[PDB]
Amino acid sequence: KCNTATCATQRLANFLVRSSNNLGPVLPPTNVGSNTY
């Protein structure tokens, strides 16, 4: 890192901010057919 975590984390921030992909707090697509069709 340079001084704090963000300077360093600026690259992994992605790893985490993008990590929300699996969580998917929301999903316009649909939420009733995710096991068959």
Curated annotation (Swiss-Prot):
User: How does the annotation summarize its subunit structure?
Assistant: Can form homodimers. Interacts with IDE and INS. Interaction with INS inhibits homodimerization and fibril formation.
State what protein this is by name: Islet amyloid polypeptide
Q: What is known of its domains?
A: The mature protein is largely unstructured in the absence of a cognate ligand, but contrary to the human protein, it does not easily form fibrillar aggregates.
Positions spanned in the full protein: 38 to 74 of 93
Provide the positions where the record notes the PTM Tyrosine amide.
Answer: 37
Q: Which organism is it from?
A: Rattus norvegicus (Rat)
Gene behind this protein: Iapp
Q: In which tissues is it expressed?
A: Abundant in the islets of Langerhans but is not present in the brain or seven other tissues examined.
| Cysteine pairings via disulfide bonds | 2-7
Q: Where in the cell is it found?
A: Secreted
Q: Report the family membership.
A: Belongs to the calcitonin family.
Q: What does this protein do?
A: Amylin/IAPP is a glucoregulatory peptide hormone that plays an important role in the regulation of energy homeostasis. Selectively inhibits insulin-stimulated glucose utilization and glycogen deposition in muscle, while not affecting adipocyte glucose metabolism. IAPP function is mediated by the CALCR-RAMPs (AMYRs) receptor complexes. Amylin can also bind CALCR receptor in the absence of RAMPs, although it is more selective for AMYRs.
